[PDB]
Design a protein around this ligand. Structure first.
Ligand code: NI
Length: 300
């Protein structure tokens, strides 16, 4: 199986947290992913969001397509995805000033708004502790990553996957997410596969042109099946972790396969500020940076 840890309530940076930080990096560098055990109030929010996600998907398509905005990438698309970005009314200057991807979220209904908003503030805390723990394992100052994520561009991909309807069973091709770290959630259906770090396997750097990671290693072994187990969130690093860590963490490649049954899932992104420039940690004299504002607009 894959390891299962329980984060503290607050990461103060003590001997126990730093040990957990080492336990995290190790699990990432061996298995490419691990699980964090949710409590009762974390599993309640996770299921209530999946609940609001399940009712929305069975609504008529003619309604779902209305949940779109020409100001944000938020809203519905046809798997059928509902992305939730930072919710900024047209009263917010960033939306007025015409900042790209800034604007309100076309929620289907307010009970979908509340259930998804409360889920996503909890994932933001688990991500902040994970970002504090990662720095402690690399012997970095505990606030190294969390300094970038103040009012960070956290967003989500509320996912539903159809059952296998043709003789093709592809739901999503091999890819690596483009953020700092991803926090996935999932029901009992199952269908998520990830690729661990393979020794000596060249990994393209997806934040650079001409070095895309998409579709790569898709048909080549191995691909760890991420089992549906009760009350856990799986955590794996994104492209911006790999860039900052200088490859000492690999952006976990993942792909989805369609099951016999309907599959609902989640995909939270704990990201830097939209005005934040990620930097390589172990090469200070290197002038390469990723500005998440243009990065997010580009990958979408
Ligand atoms: Ni992904």
């Amino acid at each position: 199986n894959l390891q299962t840890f329980e984060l503290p309530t607050e990461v103060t940076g003590c001997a126990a947290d730093i040990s957990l930080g080492r336990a995290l990096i190790q699990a990432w560098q061996k298995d490419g992913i691990f699980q964090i055990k949710t409590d009762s109030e974390q599993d309640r929010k996770t299921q209530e969001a999946m609940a609001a996600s399940k009712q929305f998907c069975k609504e008529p398509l003619t309604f779902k397509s209305s949940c779109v905005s020409d100001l944000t990438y938020s809203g519905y698309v046809a798997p059928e995805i509902f992305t939730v970005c930072k919710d900024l009314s047209v009263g917010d200057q960033r939306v007025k000033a015409g900042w790209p991807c800034h604007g309100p979220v076309p929620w289907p209904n307010n009970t979908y708004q509340k259930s998804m908003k409360t889920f996503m503030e909890e994932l933001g805390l688990a991500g902040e502790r994970l970002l504090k723990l990662t720095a402690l394992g690399f012997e970095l100052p505990i606030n190294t990553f969390t300094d970038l994520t103040r009012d960070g561009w956290h967003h989500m991909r509320v996912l539903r996957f159809p059952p296998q309807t043709s003789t093709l069973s592809r739901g999503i091709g091999a890819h690596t997410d483009y953020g700092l770290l991803v926090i996935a959630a999932q029901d009992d259906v199952g269908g998520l596969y990830i690729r661990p770090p393979v020794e000596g396997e060249k990994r393209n750097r997806n934040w650079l042109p001409g070095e895309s990671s998409a579709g790569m290693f898709e048909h080549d072994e191995p691909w760890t099946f991420v089992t549906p187990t009760p009350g856990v969130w799986t955590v794996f690093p994104g492209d911006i972790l790999q860039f900052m860590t200088g490859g000492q963490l690999l952006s976990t490649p993942h792909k989805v396969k369609l099951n016999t049954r309907e599959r609902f899932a989640c995909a939270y992104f704990h990201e830097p500020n939209f005005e934040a420039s990620a930097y390589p940690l172990f090469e200070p004299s290197a002038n390469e940076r990723i500005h998440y504002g243009e990065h997010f607009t580009n990958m979408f």
